[PDB]
Amino acid sequence: MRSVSYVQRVALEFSGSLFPHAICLGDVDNDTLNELVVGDTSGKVSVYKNDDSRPWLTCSCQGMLTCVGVGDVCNKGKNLLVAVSAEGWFHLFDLTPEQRPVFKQHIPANTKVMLISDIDGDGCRELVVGYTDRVVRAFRWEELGQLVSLKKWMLEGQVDSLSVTLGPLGLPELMVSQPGCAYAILLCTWRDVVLHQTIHNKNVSTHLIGNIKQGHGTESSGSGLFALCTLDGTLKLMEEMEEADKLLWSVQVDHQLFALEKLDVTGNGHEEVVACAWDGQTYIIDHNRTVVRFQVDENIRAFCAGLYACKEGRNSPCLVYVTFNQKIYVYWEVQLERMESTNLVKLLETKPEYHSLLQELGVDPDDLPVTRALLHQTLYHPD
């Protein structure tokens, strides 16, 4: 409903092409401080740390990275860097105290996306990949170690993103975007692919995110909310609940949305949905349909929102844009005191002791001019 103009930002030089899925942020050196991982098609992955313009480090794969990620895929309690190319290769990196990987294994080609999570509930983290031809494949790590294939699913509509959220039974799920503002639920890496629809062109590209926080300290185990975005410019937030989904809110914009992330800018535990368009019009919506629009006056190749360690060694919420002039912009003061717009008269009304503190003063807070005169006297004429 209101716009802002964030100011402080870090510009990082970055030359090369990339897919909207080859950028992420996470801890690779295992120090509770997030770095930025960017994977380009020329055969190089760059990790950015702190706020230096140059990359912190480079990783040399063999060809055409298509997805990158970080997580505990080897189930050793540590964090590792995973990179998948186009011909179905798979590279592992241990960046904890050039840069050839530590593990190589071939998988089916035509890779498009990535996800690392415990999908079943066995306590071991599995890897899920989506392909250009409506095929999804699950894997697991097994000590020898090696990647062992698992259930594999066929779909009809194009797959764009995979996510894991809590199901109605309190168990992890696996959801995949399906064109036409639809999505498919996969079933267990022990009829086979359930489909749901949420009217526009049936070939409209669609992206999905899931596992949205709802409180503080619930990050250990909790989900239930997921968001959908379409290229024609519609966004939706829904809740799994029990039988079918509940539509929490829907918004129609007039831009070409191509990304979907979650952040925490207010800092009150809840996570806000962050969307970006091709022309740079960023939307930030809380769970109460309080939109805040930012507009970087550029054209966007890729978008990424999350925690990042920029200055003074401390993780802060950040927005990340990739531009056509070989520049990555990191906006990091993006914390907001609030989402809506308000004033002192309304904010001071919420607190309860105000009406006692002013009734003891004889002034009945029924006349706004008297209240504002008293407040101006209190603030600007203390004596």
Partner: protein, 400 residues
């Protein structure tokens, strides 16, 4: 050169402009007016919705400006309390020929009940040719007979100031000689970039200051009823005078001079020492040129501070460490309180209760648009609380 704390200002809204504005673009109204160079005028305000507020920026169309005319300056004021009315003045240039024709339009709806209606005022123009390039439309209030009269003042390309007084009988604004009412405003060499006329409340004296493109700054203590120059002082600085403001640090008057190539300075003890006690604000020339400036209370302490807006996108605030907390070796000084940053060069500001709470918002017009800044609501909410509880406790202790 180090901030003594955090900036308590949080951005509320931001309305983007298609084209840029100028330092005379900003004007009063609790509404705000911002005119673009290409004839675009926007009226900023806020609206209430239950337990929330919403910024509103609506476009206004003014009558007699052709589609090729370029707006140069705008000002506004209200008629003196004996009468009623809102007066707006726009000076533009009709680009007919290599050098355009300057024009002055004065909008004032004389019809009763619509003096303050800006929609009706938008088409009530009184076009007037100029024969000079206007620079700044200012307004002043003088004492004639026994009643106050608010008049216009306009710098011109000719090094002179032109007074435009209303004619009571025939309801029209006509030029009149300046030396009749403002004897200190004659015999100038450069064009007055900024002019300030400070009154002394309950006193027929006044303090006039002006700075021109040459750097020449002139201050005159002038009596009104006798229309004589009680005293006059002048200095010759380096750069064009972006701003001069007359303010009291607590007699005991002082001036603030904000140039474009020098740190902003404050001359103290005007009526007793003239222009010799020069306290310069430390490290205020490190952020390009000081375009705007403002003198108001930003810390809610009852004592003023100096706000300086620069072209390097900076919003410095300076605080006065007076001898009331005496440190004679350092007492009575200005130190950098805090500092903010922006995305575009800042061209103007106001200090106005846009929202309607009693707290003063700081509207900042920059190259790309208008930012509205509020005080940190959490910070202010508890400060009012503690001050109110202190007052209640001290009144219970006293009144018993």
């Amino acid at each position: 050169a180090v901030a003594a704390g955090p900036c308590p200002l949080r951005e509320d809204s931001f309305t983007r402009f298609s084209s840029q504005s100028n330092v005379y673009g900003l004007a009063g109204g609790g509404e705000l007016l911002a005119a673009t160079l290409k004839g675009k005028v926007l009226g900023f305000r806020y609206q209430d919705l239950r337990q929330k507020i919403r910024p509103v920026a609506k476009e206004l169309q003014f009558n007699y400006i052709p589609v090729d005319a370029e707006i140069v300056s705008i000002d506004t004021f209200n008629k003196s309390p004996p009468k009623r009315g809102l007066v707006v003045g726009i000076t533009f240039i009709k680009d007919s020929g290599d050098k355009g024709s300057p024009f002055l339009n004065i909008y004032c709806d004389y019809e009763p009940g619509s003096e303050y209606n800006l929609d009706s005022i938008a088409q009530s123009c009184l076009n007037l040719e100029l024969q000079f390039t206007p620079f700044q439309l200012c307004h002043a209030e003088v004492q004639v007979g026994d009643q106050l009269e608010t008049v216009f003042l306009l710098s011109g390309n000719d090094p002179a100031i032109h007074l435009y007084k209303e004619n009571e009988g025939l309801h029209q604004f006509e030029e009149q000689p300046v030396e009749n009412l403002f004897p200190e405003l004659t015999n100038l060499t450069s064009s007055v970039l900024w002019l300030d006329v400070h009154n002394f409340p309950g006193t027929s004296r006044r303090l006039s200051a002006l700075g021109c493109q040459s750097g020449y700054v002139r201050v005159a203590h002038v009596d009104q009823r006798s229309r004589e120059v009680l005293q006059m002082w002048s200095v010759l600085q380096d750069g064009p005078i972006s701003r001069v403001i007359v303010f009291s640090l607590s007699d005991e008057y002082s001036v603030l001079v904000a140039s474009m190539l020098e740190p902003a300075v404050v001359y103290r003890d005007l009526l007793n020492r003239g222009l010799e006690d020069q306290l310069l604000l430390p490290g205020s020339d490190q952020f390009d040129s000081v375009l705007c400036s403002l003198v108001t209370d930003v810390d809610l302490d009852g004592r003023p501070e100096v706000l300086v807006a620069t072209y390097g996108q900076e919003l410095l605030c300076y605080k006065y460490r007076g001898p009331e907390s005496g440190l004679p070796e350092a007492q009575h000084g200005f130190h950098l309180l805090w500092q903010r940053s922006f995305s575009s060069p800042l061209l103007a500001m106001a200090h106005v209760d846009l929202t309607g709470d009693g707290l003063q918002e700081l509207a900042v017009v920059s190259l790309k648009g208008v930012h509205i800044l509020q005080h940190s609501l959490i910070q202010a909410s508890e400060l009012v609380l503690t001050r109110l509880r202190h007052q209640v406790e001290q009144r219970r202790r006293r009144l018993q």
